[PDB]
Amino acid sequence: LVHRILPVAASYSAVTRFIEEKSSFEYGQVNHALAAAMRTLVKEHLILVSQLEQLHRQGLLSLQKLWFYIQPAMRTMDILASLATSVDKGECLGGSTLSLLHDRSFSYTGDSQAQELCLYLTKAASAPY
Amino acid sequence: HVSGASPESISSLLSEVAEYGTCYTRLSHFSLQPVLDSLYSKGLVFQAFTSGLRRYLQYYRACVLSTPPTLSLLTIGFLFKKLGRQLRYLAELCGVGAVLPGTCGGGPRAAFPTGVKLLSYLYQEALHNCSNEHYPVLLSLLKTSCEPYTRFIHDWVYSGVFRDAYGEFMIQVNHEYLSFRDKLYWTHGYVL
Amino acid sequence: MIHELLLALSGYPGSIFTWNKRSGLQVSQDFPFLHPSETSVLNRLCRLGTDYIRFTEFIEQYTGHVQQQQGQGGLHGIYLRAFCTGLDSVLQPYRQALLDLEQEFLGDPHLSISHVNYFLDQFQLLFPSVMVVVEQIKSQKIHGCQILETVYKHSCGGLPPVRSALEKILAVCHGVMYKQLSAWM
């Protein structure tokens, strides 16, 4: 059960490295906006782990309750960590990472749990273009 | 042989719950595998089906957690019986769940319909079990499943835009249209 | 002998209660520790159980067993399925009762079998009766709506409990008929 709850960590350290490296002036005006609105989701992730700690302090949380509690943010991180691999993998910058955000938003057209996150990353990353 | 308060029927009773569990694991697996962003074998519509299935699996998981931690041994099974069959049925509805029933090997690996065929396979199964208690589960899967086609329809309806990846949508377009002439306009068509 | 019986009645056999397909449930009939007097009572109690197992097997056999794959009214049909959906819900109180007995045994560590006989003895009569309703269906290969009548003729039963019990099933089955008539009309 620890292993099944461990993928949200590999999708947290990989997600954070992309927000440091692709914030430099060299990567271009849009790659900066994509990571600057991806850093806001990391602040909210930290806000969740602080609430879970208070429940743990009162002896009122267990590994079966934690497993159900983190499921919503296991998905948000998974969409942010895959998208970051791709924007980095193709060395995309400028508009090559404003098309990759339009197309991924279509990929999930029925989900609405992940569609709102992507549709948001494109409103934020297309402000400079 | 030797056991701490375990007459065989307890093991047999434990075996029946187990059947339910095996399905959960396999099913949780069948839906869990996400699209991966490159599901060529399955269609856009197959990726919609799985998403919906998980929503059910999540609701199924929540009921298991809700169970009073304190309850009688026999009472726990009698409580979950309705659900236990409900899921095994859900399992068989999909080939995977049907597969590894336990009465057979994993070799059959029955092919699952995909594209329009899947949407239809479901509708027919809808009419077959319409009066049965298991029918509401299907209506739900279908409603969500049908969403992609509607968008396709809207895109090729209010708009004339022709858009597809795996060509699961029945209408088809060719390069004869790019000839842009009356004879080749007819030569370009749609599937039957 | 106590928790063991509830396990057997609940529908899972044990060595003391030997399931034989021909004999349903059957006691070994020979234990120097238990005198013959309690044996007969157990056999009597076993009868309710013999029927519980057969019913579940049948319900399991024709209900949800397949995703609608020579299917015919005896073999299958929306109506045949409806009979099964009802059979289990009519048998529900028997489940609740068995569950309740355990709570009392948890409550007290020494309750006679006779106490069991008394609480379960209202079912001792309803179960044999429901058996013929199904037995007629299988032998005559009753097909489709003809099942709706087969119960209705047994709706004139001289036991008030049985009448109420079967009536519930017809209400369930009518639902489908009302459902199919809901379209052609």
Short mmCIF file of C-alpha atoms in Angstrom, two decimals:
data_model
loop_
_atom_site.label_atom_id
_atom_site.label_comp_id
_atom_site.label_asym_id
_atom_site.label_seq_id
_atom_site.Cartn_x
_atom_site.Cartn_y
_atom_site.Cartn_z
CA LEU A 1 0.00 0.00 0.00
CA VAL A 2 3.02 2.35 0.57
CA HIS A 3 4.17 1.57 -3.03
CA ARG A 4 0.67 2.28 -4.42
CA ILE A 5 0.70 5.70 -2.58
CA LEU A 6 4.41 6.36 -3.60
CA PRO A 7 3.77 7.45 -7.33
CA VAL A 8 2.60 10.98 -6.15
CA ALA A 9 6.17 11.50 -4.82
CA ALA A 10 7.88 10.59 -8.12
CA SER A 11 5.29 12.99 -9.64
CA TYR A 12 6.39 15.72 -7.09
CA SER A 13 10.29 15.74 -7.34
CA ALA A 14 10.18 15.39 -11.19
CA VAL A 15 7.47 18.18 -11.31
CA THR A 16 9.61 20.52 -9.10
CA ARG A 17 12.88 20.11 -11.18
CA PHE A 18 10.98 21.37 -14.32
CA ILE A 19 9.81 24.55 -12.42
CA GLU A 20 13.49 25.51 -11.56
CA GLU A 21 15.19 24.69 -14.91
CA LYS A 22 12.55 26.15 -17.30
CA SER A 23 12.23 29.49 -15.44
CA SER A 24 15.51 30.95 -16.91
CA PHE A 25 15.48 33.81 -19.48
CA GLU A 26 16.94 31.43 -22.17
CA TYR A 27 13.83 29.08 -22.46
CA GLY A 28 11.58 31.94 -23.86
CA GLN A 29 8.47 33.97 -22.85
CA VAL A 30 5.79 31.12 -22.76
CA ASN A 31 7.84 28.27 -21.04
CA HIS A 32 8.25 30.84 -18.17
CA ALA A 33 4.43 31.34 -17.81
CA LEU A 34 3.71 27.54 -17.95
CA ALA A 35 6.05 26.91 -14.89
CA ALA A 36 4.92 30.16 -13.07
CA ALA A 37 1.28 28.88 -13.02
CA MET A 38 2.52 25.27 -12.35
CA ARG A 39 4.27 26.61 -9.17
CA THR A 40 0.82 27.77 -7.83
CA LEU A 41 -0.42 24.10 -7.87
CA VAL A 42 2.71 23.14 -5.80
CA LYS A 43 1.78 25.80 -3.15
CA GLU A 44 -1.74 24.21 -2.94
CA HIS A 45 -0.19 20.69 -2.73
CA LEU A 46 1.85 21.84 0.33
CA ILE A 47 -1.39 23.32 1.83
CA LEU A 48 -2.96 19.80 1.61
CA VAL A 49 -0.06 18.00 3.40
CA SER A 50 -0.30 20.56 6.33
CA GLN A 51 -4.03 19.72 6.89
CA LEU A 52 -3.27 15.93 6.79
CA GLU A 53 -0.57 16.52 9.49
CA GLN A 54 -3.13 18.09 11.91
CA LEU A 55 -5.44 15.04 11.52
CA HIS A 56 -2.38 12.78 12.12
CA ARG A 57 -1.52 14.78 15.29
CA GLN A 58 -5.00 13.94 16.77
CA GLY A 59 -4.48 10.09 16.22
CA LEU A 60 -7.53 10.31 13.82
CA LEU A 61 -5.83 9.42 10.43
CA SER A 62 -4.71 5.95 9.13
CA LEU A 63 -3.02 4.64 5.92
CA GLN A 64 -6.47 3.55 4.59
CA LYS A 65 -7.88 7.10 5.23
CA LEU A 66 -4.72 8.77 3.76
CA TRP A 67 -5.03 6.57 0.62
CA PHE A 68 -8.60 7.88 -0.08
CA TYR A 69 -7.68 11.51 0.94
CA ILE A 70 -4.75 11.94 -1.58
CA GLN A 71 -6.53 10.36 -4.63
CA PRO A 72 -7.79 13.75 -5.95
CA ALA A 73 -4.24 15.30 -5.98
CA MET A 74 -2.59 12.07 -7.23
CA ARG A 75 -4.34 12.87 -10.59
CA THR A 76 -3.53 16.64 -10.74
CA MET A 77 0.17 15.91 -10.23
CA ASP A 78 0.08 13.08 -12.86
CA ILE A 79 -1.25 15.50 -15.59
CA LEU A 80 1.38 18.18 -14.58
CA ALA A 81 4.31 15.64 -14.50
CA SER A 82 3.52 14.03 -17.92
CA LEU A 83 2.96 17.48 -19.60
CA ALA A 84 6.31 18.68 -18.17
CA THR A 85 8.12 15.56 -19.51
CA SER A 86 6.73 16.30 -23.04
CA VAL A 87 7.42 20.14 -23.11
CA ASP A 88 11.02 19.21 -22.06
CA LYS A 89 11.39 16.07 -24.29
CA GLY A 90 10.77 17.85 -27.64
CA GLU A 91 12.83 20.91 -26.58
CA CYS A 92 9.59 22.88 -27.24
CA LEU A 93 9.61 26.67 -26.60
CA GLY A 94 7.77 29.73 -27.98
CA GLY A 95 4.62 28.37 -29.69
CA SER A 96 5.69 24.73 -29.91
CA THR A 97 4.53 24.72 -26.22
CA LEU A 98 1.36 26.61 -26.88
CA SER A 99 0.16 23.93 -29.41
CA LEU A 100 1.15 20.98 -27.09
CA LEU A 101 -1.12 22.63 -24.43
CA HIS A 102 -4.06 23.10 -26.94
CA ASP A 103 -3.83 19.42 -28.11
CA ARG A 104 -3.49 17.81 -24.61
CA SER A 105 -6.64 19.79 -23.54
CA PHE A 106 -8.59 17.98 -26.33
CA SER A 107 -7.08 14.54 -25.39
CA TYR A 108 -9.22 14.54 -22.20
CA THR A 109 -12.59 15.95 -23.55
CA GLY A 110 -14.95 13.97 -21.21
CA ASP A 111 -12.95 13.76 -17.91
CA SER A 112 -13.55 17.36 -16.46
CA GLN A 113 -11.38 16.50 -13.36
CA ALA A 114 -8.18 16.91 -15.49
CA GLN A 115 -9.71 19.01 -18.36
CA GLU A 116 -10.10 22.09 -16.10
CA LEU A 117 -6.41 21.89 -15.02
CA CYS A 118 -5.16 21.84 -18.69
CA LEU A 119 -7.62 24.46 -19.93
CA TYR A 120 -6.21 26.62 -17.06
CA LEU A 121 -2.48 25.99 -17.94
CA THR A 122 -3.20 27.33 -21.49
CA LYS A 123 -5.09 30.44 -20.27
CA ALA A 124 -1.97 31.14 -18.07
CA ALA A 125 0.78 30.15 -20.65
CA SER A 126 -0.88 32.00 -23.65
CA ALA A 127 -1.03 35.40 -21.80
CA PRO A 128 2.44 36.46 -23.22
CA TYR A 129 1.85 35.13 -26.83
CA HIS B 1 -5.31 -29.43 9.03
CA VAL B 2 -4.44 -27.65 12.34
CA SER B 3 -6.01 -24.14 12.52
CA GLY B 4 -7.04 -21.58 15.20
CA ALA B 5 -10.91 -21.75 15.24
CA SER B 6 -11.22 -22.46 11.45
CA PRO B 7 -13.76 -25.25 10.50
CA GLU B 8 -13.54 -25.72 6.69
CA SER B 9 -16.78 -23.94 5.80
CA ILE B 10 -15.21 -20.71 7.20
CA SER B 11 -12.50 -21.19 4.52
CA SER B 12 -15.25 -21.86 1.91
CA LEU B 13 -17.07 -18.68 3.06
CA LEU B 14 -13.71 -16.82 2.93
CA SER B 15 -13.25 -18.26 -0.63
CA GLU B 16 -16.55 -16.65 -1.86
CA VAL B 17 -15.46 -13.13 -0.69
CA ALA B 18 -12.13 -13.87 -2.30
CA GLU B 19 -13.82 -14.39 -5.62
CA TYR B 20 -15.18 -10.89 -5.24
CA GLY B 21 -11.74 -9.58 -4.33
CA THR B 22 -9.97 -11.13 -7.28
CA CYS B 23 -12.36 -9.29 -9.54
CA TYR B 24 -11.70 -5.95 -7.78
CA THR B 25 -7.96 -6.35 -8.29
CA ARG B 26 -8.28 -7.37 -11.92
CA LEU B 27 -10.96 -4.75 -12.59
CA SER B 28 -9.15 -2.03 -10.68
CA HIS B 29 -6.27 -2.99 -12.98
CA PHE B 30 -8.36 -3.03 -16.28
CA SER B 31 -9.67 0.56 -15.65
CA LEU B 32 -6.54 1.82 -13.75
CA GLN B 33 -4.25 1.44 -16.77
CA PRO B 34 -4.69 5.03 -18.08
CA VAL B 35 -4.58 5.99 -21.80
CA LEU B 36 -0.73 6.75 -21.48
CA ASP B 37 -1.32 9.51 -24.20
CA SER B 38 -0.60 6.88 -26.98
CA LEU B 39 -3.41 4.23 -26.88
CA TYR B 40 -3.36 3.31 -30.64
CA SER B 41 -5.03 -0.10 -30.03
CA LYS B 42 -8.03 1.41 -28.17
CA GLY B 43 -9.95 4.50 -29.46
CA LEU B 44 -10.79 7.89 -27.92
CA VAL B 45 -14.15 6.26 -26.96
CA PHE B 46 -12.38 3.32 -25.14
CA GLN B 47 -10.46 5.92 -23.02
CA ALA B 48 -13.87 7.49 -22.03
CA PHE B 49 -15.22 4.04 -20.97
CA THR B 50 -12.38 3.36 -18.58
CA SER B 51 -12.63 6.82 -17.00
CA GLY B 52 -16.25 6.20 -16.17
CA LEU B 53 -15.54 2.69 -14.88
CA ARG B 54 -13.08 4.08 -12.35
CA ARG B 55 -15.74 6.50 -11.01
CA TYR B 56 -17.84 3.36 -10.23
CA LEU B 57 -14.79 1.51 -8.84
CA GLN B 58 -14.10 4.52 -6.55
CA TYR B 59 -17.73 4.46 -5.32
CA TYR B 60 -17.42 0.64 -4.85
CA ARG B 61 -14.14 1.20 -2.84
CA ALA B 62 -15.85 3.85 -0.63
CA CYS B 63 -18.65 1.39 0.39
CA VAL B 64 -15.98 -1.19 1.40
CA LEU B 65 -14.30 1.48 3.63
CA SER B 66 -17.69 2.56 5.09
CA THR B 67 -18.27 -1.00 6.46
CA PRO B 68 -18.42 -0.85 10.32
CA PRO B 69 -14.99 -1.98 11.52
CA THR B 70 -16.99 -4.01 14.11
CA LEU B 71 -19.46 -6.51 12.54
CA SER B 72 -20.32 -10.30 12.78
CA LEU B 73 -18.39 -12.68 10.56
CA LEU B 74 -21.35 -14.13 8.69
CA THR B 75 -23.10 -10.78 8.78
CA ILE B 76 -20.29 -9.13 6.65
CA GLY B 77 -20.89 -11.52 3.68
CA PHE B 78 -24.70 -11.37 3.78
CA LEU B 79 -24.28 -7.56 3.74
CA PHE B 80 -22.07 -7.49 0.62
CA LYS B 81 -23.78 -10.28 -1.31
CA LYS B 82 -25.84 -7.96 -3.54
CA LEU B 83 -22.78 -5.93 -4.40
CA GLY B 84 -20.62 -9.05 -4.78
CA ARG B 85 -22.67 -10.37 -7.64
CA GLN B 86 -23.26 -6.84 -9.00
CA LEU B 87 -19.55 -6.42 -9.56
CA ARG B 88 -18.91 -9.98 -10.87
CA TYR B 89 -21.53 -9.12 -13.50
CA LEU B 90 -19.79 -5.81 -14.17
CA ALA B 91 -16.60 -7.87 -14.49
CA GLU B 92 -17.99 -10.31 -17.03
CA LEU B 93 -19.44 -7.37 -19.01
CA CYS B 94 -15.81 -6.62 -19.85
CA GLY B 95 -13.75 -9.53 -21.23
CA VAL B 96 -10.89 -9.06 -18.73
CA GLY B 97 -13.16 -9.40 -15.71
CA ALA B 98 -14.94 -12.24 -17.43
CA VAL B 99 -11.43 -13.66 -18.04
CA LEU B 100 -9.56 -15.12 -15.03
CA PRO B 101 -13.04 -16.09 -13.73
CA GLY B 102 -10.98 -18.74 -11.80
CA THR B 103 -12.76 -21.61 -13.62
CA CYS B 104 -10.38 -21.03 -16.60
CA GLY B 105 -6.77 -19.89 -17.36
CA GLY B 106 -5.79 -16.33 -18.50
CA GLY B 107 -5.08 -17.70 -22.03
CA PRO B 108 -8.50 -16.88 -23.64
CA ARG B 109 -7.75 -13.09 -23.34
CA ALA B 110 -11.08 -12.36 -25.17
CA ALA B 111 -10.91 -9.28 -27.51
CA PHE B 112 -12.98 -6.27 -26.21
CA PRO B 113 -14.91 -4.39 -28.94
CA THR B 114 -13.53 -0.82 -29.53
CA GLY B 115 -14.81 2.28 -31.42
CA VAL B 116 -18.48 2.31 -32.63
CA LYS B 117 -18.57 -1.50 -32.11
CA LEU B 118 -17.98 -1.08 -28.39
CA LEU B 119 -20.64 1.66 -28.18
CA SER B 120 -23.09 -0.71 -29.92
CA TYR B 121 -21.96 -3.83 -27.98
CA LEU B 122 -22.97 -1.91 -24.91
CA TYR B 123 -26.33 -0.69 -26.24
CA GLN B 124 -27.44 -4.19 -27.13
CA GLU B 125 -26.37 -5.49 -23.66
CA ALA B 126 -28.41 -2.47 -22.36
CA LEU B 127 -31.69 -3.81 -23.85
CA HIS B 128 -30.88 -7.43 -22.74
CA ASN B 129 -30.63 -6.54 -18.98
CA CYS B 130 -33.02 -3.49 -19.11
CA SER B 131 -35.57 -4.92 -16.53
CA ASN B 132 -32.79 -6.47 -14.31
CA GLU B 133 -31.47 -4.80 -11.05
CA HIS B 134 -27.97 -4.32 -12.69
CA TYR B 135 -29.39 -1.94 -15.43
CA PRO B 136 -28.65 1.51 -13.80
CA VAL B 137 -24.83 0.81 -13.79
CA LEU B 138 -24.99 0.48 -17.65
CA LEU B 139 -27.00 3.61 -18.30
CA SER B 140 -24.27 5.57 -16.51
CA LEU B 141 -21.39 4.06 -18.41
CA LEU B 142 -23.21 4.68 -21.64
CA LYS B 143 -24.10 8.30 -21.00
CA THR B 144 -20.50 9.26 -20.52
CA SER B 145 -19.30 6.93 -23.19
CA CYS B 146 -21.55 8.59 -25.77
CA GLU B 147 -20.05 12.05 -25.18
CA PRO B 148 -17.18 11.90 -27.69
CA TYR B 149 -19.46 11.03 -30.59
CA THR B 150 -21.69 13.94 -29.86
CA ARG B 151 -18.76 16.31 -30.02
CA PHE B 152 -17.67 14.68 -33.26
CA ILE B 153 -21.18 15.21 -34.48
CA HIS B 154 -21.17 18.83 -33.38
CA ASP B 155 -17.81 19.44 -35.09
CA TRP B 156 -19.04 17.85 -38.31
CA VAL B 157 -22.48 19.38 -37.84
CA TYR B 158 -22.67 23.05 -36.88
CA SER B 159 -19.11 23.18 -38.18
CA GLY B 160 -17.83 21.38 -41.25
CA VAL B 161 -14.48 20.65 -39.56
CA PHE B 162 -13.32 17.05 -40.20
CA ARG B 163 -11.30 15.87 -37.13
CA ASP B 164 -10.21 12.31 -36.03
CA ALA B 165 -7.10 10.33 -34.84
CA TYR B 166 -7.86 6.54 -35.01
CA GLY B 167 -10.79 6.97 -37.47
CA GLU B 168 -13.27 5.18 -35.10
CA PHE B 169 -15.89 7.76 -36.29
CA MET B 170 -17.80 6.13 -39.21
CA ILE B 171 -17.65 9.17 -41.60
CA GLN B 172 -14.30 9.06 -43.55
CA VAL B 173 -12.44 11.66 -45.72
CA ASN B 174 -9.96 11.03 -48.61
CA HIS B 175 -7.44 13.14 -50.65
CA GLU B 176 -9.78 13.01 -53.71
CA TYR B 177 -11.58 15.96 -52.00
CA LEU B 178 -8.22 17.78 -52.22
CA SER B 179 -8.64 17.33 -56.04
CA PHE B 180 -11.47 19.81 -55.36
CA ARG B 181 -13.73 18.85 -58.37
CA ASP B 182 -17.30 17.41 -58.83
CA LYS B 183 -16.16 13.88 -59.93
CA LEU B 184 -13.55 13.58 -57.11
CA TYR B 185 -15.99 15.30 -54.66
CA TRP B 186 -18.23 12.19 -55.21
CA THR B 187 -15.16 9.82 -55.27
CA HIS B 188 -14.46 11.18 -51.73
CA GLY B 189 -17.39 9.87 -49.61
CA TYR B 190 -18.08 8.56 -46.11
CA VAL B 191 -18.29 4.94 -44.84
CA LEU B 192 -21.69 3.31 -45.54
CA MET C 1 -22.74 -27.87 17.32
CA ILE C 2 -24.09 -24.29 17.76
CA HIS C 3 -22.11 -21.85 15.54
CA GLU C 4 -21.68 -24.84 13.19
CA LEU C 5 -25.44 -25.10 12.46
CA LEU C 6 -25.77 -21.37 11.63
CA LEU C 7 -22.84 -21.85 9.19
CA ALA C 8 -24.62 -24.76 7.55
CA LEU C 9 -28.06 -23.04 7.39
CA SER C 10 -26.34 -19.94 6.02
CA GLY C 11 -25.41 -22.10 3.03
CA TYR C 12 -21.80 -23.36 3.48
CA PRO C 13 -21.32 -27.05 4.51
CA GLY C 14 -19.04 -28.61 7.22
CA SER C 15 -17.92 -32.22 8.04
CA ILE C 16 -20.68 -32.67 10.71
CA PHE C 17 -23.25 -31.53 8.06
CA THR C 18 -22.20 -33.53 4.93
CA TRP C 19 -23.61 -32.08 1.68
CA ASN C 20 -24.56 -34.83 -0.80
CA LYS C 21 -26.23 -33.56 -4.01
CA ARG C 22 -28.68 -36.48 -3.70
CA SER C 23 -29.19 -36.07 0.07
CA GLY C 24 -29.03 -32.26 0.36
CA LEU C 25 -27.68 -31.75 3.88
CA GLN C 26 -27.31 -34.92 6.01
CA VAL C 27 -25.94 -35.57 9.53
CA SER C 28 -23.32 -38.37 9.81
CA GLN C 29 -26.01 -40.09 12.00
CA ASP C 30 -23.30 -41.58 14.30
CA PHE C 31 -21.53 -39.61 17.08
CA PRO C 32 -21.25 -41.43 20.47
CA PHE C 33 -21.05 -37.96 22.15
CA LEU C 34 -24.56 -36.83 20.94
CA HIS C 35 -27.63 -39.01 21.87
CA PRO C 36 -30.23 -39.82 19.10
CA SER C 37 -32.81 -37.31 20.44
CA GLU C 38 -31.01 -34.16 19.09
CA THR C 39 -30.23 -35.87 15.72
CA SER C 40 -33.82 -35.90 14.44
CA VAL C 41 -34.26 -32.22 15.37
CA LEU C 42 -31.13 -31.36 13.42
CA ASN C 43 -32.41 -33.28 10.39
CA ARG C 44 -35.65 -31.35 10.65
CA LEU C 45 -33.68 -28.10 10.87
CA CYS C 46 -31.53 -29.30 7.95
CA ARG C 47 -34.57 -29.42 5.66
CA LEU C 48 -34.89 -25.62 5.71
CA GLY C 49 -31.20 -25.57 4.84
CA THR C 50 -31.52 -28.19 2.08
CA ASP C 51 -33.92 -25.82 0.36
CA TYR C 52 -31.75 -22.71 1.01
CA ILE C 53 -28.80 -24.23 -0.84
CA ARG C 54 -30.87 -25.45 -3.82
CA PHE C 55 -32.50 -22.06 -4.21
CA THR C 56 -29.25 -20.17 -4.21
CA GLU C 57 -27.73 -22.61 -6.67
CA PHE C 58 -30.65 -22.14 -9.04
CA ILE C 59 -30.67 -18.35 -8.64
CA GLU C 60 -26.91 -18.30 -9.27
CA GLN C 61 -27.36 -20.70 -12.21
CA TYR C 62 -29.72 -18.49 -14.34
CA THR C 63 -29.10 -14.97 -12.91
CA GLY C 64 -26.11 -12.81 -14.04
CA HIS C 65 -24.32 -16.10 -14.96
CA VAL C 66 -23.78 -14.62 -18.50
CA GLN C 67 -24.03 -11.20 -20.27
CA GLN C 68 -27.04 -12.54 -22.29
CA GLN C 69 -24.47 -14.76 -24.15
CA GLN C 70 -31.03 -21.96 -27.88
CA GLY C 71 -32.29 -19.69 -25.07
CA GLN C 72 -36.04 -20.23 -24.49
CA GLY C 73 -38.54 -19.65 -21.64
CA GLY C 74 -37.45 -22.73 -19.69
CA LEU C 75 -33.79 -22.05 -20.47
CA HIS C 76 -33.91 -18.23 -20.19
CA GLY C 77 -35.91 -15.06 -20.80
CA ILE C 78 -36.43 -11.62 -19.28
CA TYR C 79 -39.29 -13.17 -17.26
CA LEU C 80 -37.18 -16.10 -16.01
CA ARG C 81 -34.61 -13.57 -14.78
CA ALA C 82 -37.39 -11.58 -13.03
CA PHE C 83 -38.45 -14.71 -11.05
CA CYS C 84 -34.87 -15.00 -9.75
CA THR C 85 -34.56 -11.28 -8.86
CA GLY C 86 -37.64 -11.74 -6.64
CA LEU C 87 -36.80 -15.16 -5.19
CA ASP C 88 -33.75 -13.80 -3.32
CA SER C 89 -35.62 -10.68 -1.91
CA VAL C 90 -38.51 -12.83 -0.62
CA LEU C 91 -35.86 -15.06 1.11
CA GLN C 92 -34.21 -11.93 2.64
CA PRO C 93 -36.02 -12.15 6.04
CA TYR C 94 -34.54 -15.68 6.56
CA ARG C 95 -31.13 -14.15 6.20
CA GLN C 96 -31.94 -11.40 8.75
CA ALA C 97 -33.28 -13.96 11.22
CA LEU C 98 -30.24 -16.21 11.04
CA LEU C 99 -28.03 -13.10 11.51
CA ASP C 100 -30.11 -12.11 14.60
CA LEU C 101 -29.80 -15.55 16.23
CA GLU C 102 -26.02 -15.12 16.30
CA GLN C 103 -26.39 -11.81 18.18
CA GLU C 104 -28.30 -13.67 20.95
CA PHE C 105 -25.73 -16.50 21.05
CA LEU C 106 -23.07 -13.77 21.32
CA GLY C 107 -25.32 -12.38 24.09
CA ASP C 108 -25.60 -15.77 25.96
CA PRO C 109 -23.20 -18.77 25.76
CA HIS C 110 -25.72 -21.65 26.27
CA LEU C 111 -28.97 -21.61 24.15
CA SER C 112 -30.73 -24.96 23.37
CA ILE C 113 -31.40 -26.10 19.76
CA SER C 114 -35.11 -26.00 20.65
CA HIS C 115 -34.67 -22.21 20.96
CA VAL C 116 -33.43 -22.30 17.35
CA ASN C 117 -36.39 -24.45 16.32
CA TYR C 118 -38.83 -21.88 17.74
CA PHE C 119 -37.38 -18.78 15.99
CA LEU C 120 -36.88 -20.40 12.54
CA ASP C 121 -40.18 -22.43 12.62
CA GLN C 122 -42.20 -19.77 10.64
CA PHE C 123 -39.84 -20.40 7.66
CA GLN C 124 -40.18 -24.20 8.18
CA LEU C 125 -43.55 -23.82 6.32
CA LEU C 126 -42.99 -20.98 3.72
CA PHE C 127 -39.91 -22.62 2.12
CA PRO C 128 -41.42 -25.99 1.17
CA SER C 129 -44.33 -24.13 -0.43
CA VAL C 130 -42.22 -21.83 -2.59
CA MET C 131 -40.41 -24.93 -3.81
CA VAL C 132 -43.30 -26.18 -5.95
CA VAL C 133 -43.69 -22.77 -7.62
CA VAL C 134 -40.18 -23.21 -9.08
CA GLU C 135 -40.47 -27.03 -9.52
CA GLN C 136 -43.47 -26.57 -11.88
CA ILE C 137 -41.48 -23.95 -13.87
CA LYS C 138 -38.56 -26.33 -14.60
CA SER C 139 -40.47 -29.53 -15.50
CA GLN C 140 -43.09 -27.94 -17.79
CA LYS C 141 -40.39 -25.75 -19.39
CA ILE C 142 -42.80 -22.88 -18.70
CA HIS C 143 -41.84 -20.16 -21.18
CA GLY C 144 -42.26 -16.39 -20.99
CA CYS C 145 -45.45 -14.92 -19.56
CA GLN C 146 -46.82 -18.39 -18.89
CA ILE C 147 -44.70 -18.10 -15.67
CA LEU C 148 -46.88 -15.06 -14.64
CA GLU C 149 -49.94 -17.38 -14.46
CA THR C 150 -48.10 -20.32 -12.76
CA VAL C 151 -47.49 -18.21 -9.64
CA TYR C 152 -51.01 -16.65 -9.81
CA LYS C 153 -52.71 -20.08 -9.52
CA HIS C 154 -50.55 -20.66 -6.35
CA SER C 155 -51.61 -17.09 -5.25
CA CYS C 156 -54.81 -18.82 -3.97
CA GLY C 157 -52.67 -20.53 -1.29
CA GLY C 158 -54.31 -21.47 2.02
CA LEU C 159 -51.41 -20.18 4.10
CA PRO C 160 -51.73 -16.41 4.52
CA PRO C 161 -47.92 -15.96 4.78
CA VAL C 162 -47.26 -17.85 1.52
CA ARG C 163 -49.90 -15.77 -0.30
CA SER C 164 -48.22 -12.50 0.72
CA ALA C 165 -44.84 -14.07 -0.02
CA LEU C 166 -45.62 -15.12 -3.65
CA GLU C 167 -47.61 -11.91 -4.30
CA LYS C 168 -44.40 -9.94 -3.95
CA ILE C 169 -42.81 -11.95 -6.80
CA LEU C 170 -45.75 -11.30 -9.23
CA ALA C 171 -45.43 -7.57 -8.53
CA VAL C 172 -41.75 -7.84 -9.55
CA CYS C 173 -42.49 -9.88 -12.73
CA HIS C 174 -45.38 -7.65 -13.77
CA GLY C 175 -42.83 -4.85 -13.72
CA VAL C 176 -41.16 -6.30 -16.83
CA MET C 177 -44.49 -6.97 -18.60
CA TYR C 178 -45.64 -3.49 -17.76
CA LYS C 179 -42.15 -2.54 -19.05
CA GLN C 180 -42.50 -4.28 -22.49
CA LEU C 181 -46.13 -3.14 -22.85
CA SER C 182 -44.75 0.31 -21.97
CA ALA C 183 -43.19 0.37 -25.49
CA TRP C 184 -45.36 -1.48 -28.03
CA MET C 185 -48.30 0.57 -26.86
#
